[model samples]
Target: APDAVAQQWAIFRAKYLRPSGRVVDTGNGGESHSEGQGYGMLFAASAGDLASFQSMWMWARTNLQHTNDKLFSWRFLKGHQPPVPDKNNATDGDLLIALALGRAGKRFQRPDYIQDAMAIYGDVLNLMTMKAGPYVVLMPGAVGFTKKDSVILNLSYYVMPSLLQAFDLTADPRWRQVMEDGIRLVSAGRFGQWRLPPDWLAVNRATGALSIASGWPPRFSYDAIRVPLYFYWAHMLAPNVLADFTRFWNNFGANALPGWVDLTTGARSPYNAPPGYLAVAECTGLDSAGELPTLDHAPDYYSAALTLLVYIARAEETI
Candidate 1:
């Protein structure tokens, strides 16, 4: 299985990892983003591909992190002269990078890598988290997510397994709170006929009321897909929350699951769920045999990346 994952990494690396260390999102206009780089770094580290990890970290540090802080810029538009016009940091990307760095450090005996991871981890606690009434929510980015009457949150940004590691590494109770509240939010944040989570959600400052956020599409799409991934990655396999996702996918059957669903209108994408989404279904025990999908199915960058993540998660569980 380890060898199989390594081969999958080779496929992913050849398709996505650019000579400049940017992980290309071939589906999204050839641009790179912090999340992709984080995944690149993680994949490299897990496979013990030090050179790949270093180049990606260098590219991210030089390009996306010009804000003089540990957190990274969210996007890099390839066609622009200045690729990163917005400087806001996405906590999930930062967390992913940090987690990768920590693993790389331990594997390669580079304390510098560990130190870098620690710095990013600390800044995440400082810059990206906020107390909203009774729960601590992880913001989608450092800024622009907060509004007049409500704060915008991407609950999926709270990478569950990473938070568990954060607590284990730092012994910080806040990490525990972040994890707990994130799970609690997932429990209460479900909506519509299917009761699945949305990609972006709003919390009223005064009442702690959760609504589908205003600016983004009120659908469970690419972003919320990671919620179950991270939760299952962390081994929080409670059927109550995860069953919500299982029920959703089951309703559509194995072959016809749409890419996203409108929480209010119940409108669904005409397109079917990608292999990545199906990989997620596999992770949530949708597969009766508890098997991963054939790893050779590398449809695109994000799909391949998510499939690799499921592979990595299973590897971690094997330990």
Candidate 2:
């Protein structure tokens, strides 16, 4: 339904948006982060709500955009000495904001938005893009991911569609390389019996070997869920990339799918996959995991975001 997108945005705004322009993550201690704000801007822009998109962009610029560069601070925690506890930038959040700005600028015919997107696009290429052997790798954040031996990667952080946008807007051939390597990396990073990518993966600088990164739970959980979402969004749905994911989701028959699975051990989440994850499962165009639920029914911030994102991805890719 054409109304589905508008109605979903309405529901999401009511629950998570603050008048001050922060997109609160009620599920995560009522904090706001660059990722959420980026999603908020993207959703507003996609819904053709110029006012909403502008306020969100302004709030993010005021609160999250870093002083040193166009890239944003990754987090905002209330009641702390400084709301932005970590000034480090999340690559995905930065890219999403830029992607939304570019799309919104083109759709809404706003030059300022396009220019702003280009500025961030420049810095993202400067600071976050890295090379390992012949493959282009991206850091999940500004710091702490690169080790002496290898660089840690968040697979879902490789937003392939955004890379396509970045390539066209910036005309950087590296973004194209990044897109190719992203598909290569995801195809190469399979682990465990299910052959799925981990939430965090380590690629050796010298050898280019992939392993589940240390210091984080070795689960294909919240972060890795976006892997499939991006794959479907880009229409790069190589069966090699998703057959395992589909098989894993349907393993339990999809009636009440588990939220995540520990790749090290076959242990699954105690909780069922939310309506949003199921939305992604349905997005694969590979499996009809149970019926997709309406976004209004999503119980919290992350799933609500995911549900709306699925809608945006399908709408953008299909037509």
Candidate 3:
């Protein structure tokens, strides 16, 4: 896997770097999945793909969603545009864009990219705040269960990484503290099936525990594939203090999962469908029909999983 990660990175780099100068997302979704480019930048840096790294950075800088430099969600061939800008939903674009840019800056020693990330980070922070003491609200101004809070996990998804990346970029004591508090609030659970954070969690400021009623539109029940990988990246970036996260990765497998079977009961969900039109699905976690979705979960999840596994194997002197 380590050698493959190295080789795969080479392929990724050569594919994206245009001889002309345009860094493109050759991965079907094209530039619409800006996060893919961002993740590509992150992985290219990790794997020492300097050329791809540079090209991707340039492309992002030039083509970033200008409406709000922060609103940069890549809509899989639709283009790098915000799906909807209803005040609340626009922040995901910002959060992901900021995260990728911050990682690129730190990894490549590019202070300018770091500064770019800071601007986006600042906007999201001002818009959103901690709701259940530590965990964050999804967006800035929104009512109860009104899209923003409807699915708490998605907010946590955006919030945790945003906080971690913020801390990484600035070395700010405040950001560090806030990130930990948010993680604890998100990861707290009954130590069983629900022990794992559901894609959404409702919190009650009063009980100081999870709240059941606040969930609207029914929080996504499945364990989203992105959250764990995001957590893994958090621990990777902060290895010293986040030792438990590394352990979590150790006890659980790296981003690679055979399928989403129930850990306790071995019961698999019915989410899997044939990836007839989704070619990217073949490369990732097993779905219900023993197929993976070609959406973000497939390629992104596979890359994260395989990269971490390679890291672990190397650390163990297996490679």
- Winning model by TM-score: 2
Candidate 2, residue 306: the lDDT equals 90
Q: Is candidate 1 or 2 superior in TM-score?
A: 2
Better of 2 and 3 by TM-score: 2
Model 1 spans > 4 angstroms off: 27-30, 294-296
TM-score sort, best first: 2, 1, 3
After superposition, the stretches of candidate 3 with alpha carbons farther than 4 Å from their true spots are 1-5, 13-31, 62-64, 68-71, 74-76, 79-96, 133-151, 155-162, 171-174, 189-194, 204-223, 226-258, 261-266, 270-319
TM-score per candidate, chains pooled = 0.94, 0.95, 0.59
Higher-ranked by lDDT: 1 or 2? 2
- Lowest lDDT sum, 10 consecutive residues, model 3, at 273-282
Residue-by-residue lDDT tens digits, candidate 2, 1-319: 6666777888888888888888997676558888998999888988888888988999999999988899999988888888887899999999889988998999899999999999998888889988775678888998899889899999988776778788888898777777888889889897998888899999989999889998898988888888989887887867876777778777765467778888889898888988788888787643574345776678878889998988888788787
Off by over 4 Å in 2: 28-30, 289-291
- Per-residue CA lDDT of model 3 for 214-257, tens digit only, reads 33322223223344444544442233323433343334342332
TM-score, model 3 to reference: 0.59
What's the lDDT for candidate 2? 0.85
The CA lDDT at 57 in model 1 is: 95
